[PDB]
Amino acid sequence: TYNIILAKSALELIPEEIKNKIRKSRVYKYDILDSNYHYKAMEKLKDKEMRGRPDIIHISLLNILDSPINHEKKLNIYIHTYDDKVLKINPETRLPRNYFRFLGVMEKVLKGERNHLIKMEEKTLEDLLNEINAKKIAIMTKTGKLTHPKLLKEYDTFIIGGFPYGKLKINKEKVFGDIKEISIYNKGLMAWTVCGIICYSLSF
Amino acid sequence: TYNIILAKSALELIPEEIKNKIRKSRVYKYDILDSNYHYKAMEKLKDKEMRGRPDIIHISLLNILDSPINHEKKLNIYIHTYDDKVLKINPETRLPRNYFRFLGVMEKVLKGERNHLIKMEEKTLEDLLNEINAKKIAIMTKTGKLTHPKLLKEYDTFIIGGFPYGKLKINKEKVFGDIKEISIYNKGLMAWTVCGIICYSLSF
Ligand SMILES: Nc1ncnc2c1ncn2[C@@H]1O[C@H](C[C@@H](N)CC[C@H](N)C(=O)O)[C@@H](O)[C@H]1O
Numbered sequence: 001t002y003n004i005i006l007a008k009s010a011l012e013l014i015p016e017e018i019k020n021k022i023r024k025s026r027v028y029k030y031d032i033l034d035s036n037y038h039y040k041a042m043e044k045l046k047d048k049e050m051r052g053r054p055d056i057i058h059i060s061l062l063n064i065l066d067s068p069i070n071h072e073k074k075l076n077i078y079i080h081t082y083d084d085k086v087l088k089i090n091p092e093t094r095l096p097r098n099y100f101r102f103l104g105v106m107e108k109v110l111k112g113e114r115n116h117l118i119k120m121e122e123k124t125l126e127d128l129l130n131e132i133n134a135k136k137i138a139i140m141t142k143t144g145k146l147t148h149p150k151l152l153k154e155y156d157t158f159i160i161g162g163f164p165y166g167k168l169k170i171n172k173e174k175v176f177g178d179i180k181e182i183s184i185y186n187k188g189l190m191a192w193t194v195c196g197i198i199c200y201s202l203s204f
Numbered sequence: 205t206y207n208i209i210l211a212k213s214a215l216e217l218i219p220e221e222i223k224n225k226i227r228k229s230r231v232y233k234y235d236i237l238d239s240n241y242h243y244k245a246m247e248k249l250k251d252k253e254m255r256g257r258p259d260i261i262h263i264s265l266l267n268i269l270d271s272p273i274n275h276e277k278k279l280n281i282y283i284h285t286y287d288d289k290v291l292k293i294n295p296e297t298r299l300p301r302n303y304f305r306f307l308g309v310m311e312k313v314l315k316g317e318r319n320h321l322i323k324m325e326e327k328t329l330e331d332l333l334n335e336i337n338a339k340k341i342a343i344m345t346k347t348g349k350l351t352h353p354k355l356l357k358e359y360d361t362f363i364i365g366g367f368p369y370g371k372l373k374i375n376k377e378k379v380f381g382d383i384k385e386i387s388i389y390n391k392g393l394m395a396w397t398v399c400g401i402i403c404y405s406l407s408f
C-alpha cells in the first residue's frame with residue numbers, strides 16, 4: 001500500500017484568536033475557517049495566506065477517493081492540518097459532493113465527534129510519518145527535482161501541501177524515513193491535480 | 205491538439221415543464237437545475253436521473269483546466285449539455301473554485317450573456333463532433349473495451365458523460381469520424397476521474 005497525505009492543510013475550526021472579529025451570518029453557518037467568508041477577520045492571523053481554504057481538501061479527496069488505486073484498496077489516506085490534527089480517511093468514505101455538506105461533516109470530526117469512517121487524532125506531521133512507518137517519502141513541490149510520474153512507484157509515501165500559498169516544511173531530524181523533494185511539472189499545479197497525477201501514476 | 209468533451213452534461217437552466225414547481229430562494233438563487241435543491245420538483249421530469257448535477261461539470265473542469273496537457277495548450281474543451289447546448293471553454297479560463305460562483309458564471313452563459321472565455325451555441329453532440337472535424341473518437345464508458353490509458357494518444361477526440369447515471373447515447377450514422385467505445389477500468393468511475401485519467405495519459 002501507499003500513503004497519501006495532504007499536509008499542513010488549510011482545514012481548521014475558527015481559531016479562538018479571531019472569533020471576536022467574526023460576525024456570524026446565515027449564508028455561512030459553519031465553524032470552519034474559510035477565507036471567502038472570514039477574509040477580514042483573518043487580516044492579523046498568523047500565516048493567514050496559507051489558512052482558510054477547506055475546498056482544497058474537498059476537491060483533492062473527491063479525486064483520491066474515486067481513483068482506481070483507492071478502489072483497489074491500495075491507499076492509506078490522511079489529512080494533516082495546519083494545527084496538527086490528522087484525519088485518517090477510510091477508503092470507502094462517501095464524501096459529500098456538496099461543499100457545505102462537506103464542511104458539516106468536517107466540523108463535527110474536528111470537534112471530536114465520532115465518525116466511524118474518519119478518525120481524528122492530534123498529531124504532528126513528523127509523528128504521523130514515523131507511526132505509519134513511512135520509509136521513502138516524496139514531498140511534492142514545484143521546486144523539487146523534476147521527476148516522471150512512472151518513478152513515483154518507487155516511494156511508499158506522498159506528501160502534498162493542502163494549502164493555497166507557501167512551501168511545505170518538514171523537520172528532517174524528526175522523521176525516521178528518507179525525504180526527497182519531488183516536482184512532477186515545472187509550473188505550480190493545484191493540490192488536487194497533483195493528487196490525481198500521483199494516484200493515476202500508481203495504477204497505470 | 206486533442207478535443208475533450210463532457211457530453212449530455214447535467215447542466216441546464218430549469219426545464220420549462222417544471223418551472224412552476226421551483227422558486228428562487230436565498231439558499232439557492234440560481235436558475236440552474238440542481239437535484240440537491242430541486243429533487244422533489246424533478247419527480248416527473250424525463251431522464252431526471254441523469255439531469256441536475258452541475259457539480260459533475262464543475263469538478264471535471266477543475267481537473268481538466270489545471271492539467272499539464274492544458275497548461276501546454278494542447279486541449280480544446282467542450283461541454284455538451286443534456287439540452288443540446290455546447291460551451292467552448294477557453295484553456296485560460298479561471299474557473300471559480302466556489303460551486304455557487306461557478307453556478308453564477310454558468311447561469312449567465314446559458315442565458316446568452318457574453319462571456320469572452322466561455323462561448324455558448326445551440327448544437328447537438330453529433331454536430332459538435334463534425335464541426336471540429338473529429339476523426340478518431342474514443343467514447344469512454346465502463347462497458348467499452350478495456351484499454352490501457354497509454355493508447356489514448358492515438359485518438360483525437362474523447363467523450364465523457366457529464367451525468368450521474370446511465371450511458372451516453374450517440375447516433376453514429378450522423379457522425380463523420382470513427383467511434384470506438386473504450387473502458388479504462390473495470391468499475392464505474394466518476395466523470396472527473398475519467399477526465400483526469402485521460403488528461404494525464406496525454407502528458408505522460
Ligand atoms: N509542479 C509541482 N510538482 C510537485 N508538487 C506540486 C507542484 N505544484 C503544486 N504542488 C503541490 O500542491 C501543493 C499546494 C499548492 N497550492 C502550493 C504550490 C506551490 N507552488 C508548491 O510547489 O509548493 C503544494 O504544497 C505542493 O505540494
Ligand SMILES: Nc1ncnc2c1ncn2[C@@H]1O[C@H](C[C@@H](N)CC[C@H](N)C(=O)O)[C@@H](O)[C@H]1O
Binds near residue numbers: 363387
Ligand atoms: N470504468 C470506466 N472506464 C471508462 N469510462 C468510464 C468508466 N466509469 C465511468 N466512465 C465515464 O464517466 C461518465 C459518467 C458516469 N457517472 C456514468 C457511469 C456509467 N457506469 C458509465 O461507465 O457509463 C460515463 O458516461 C463514462 O463516460
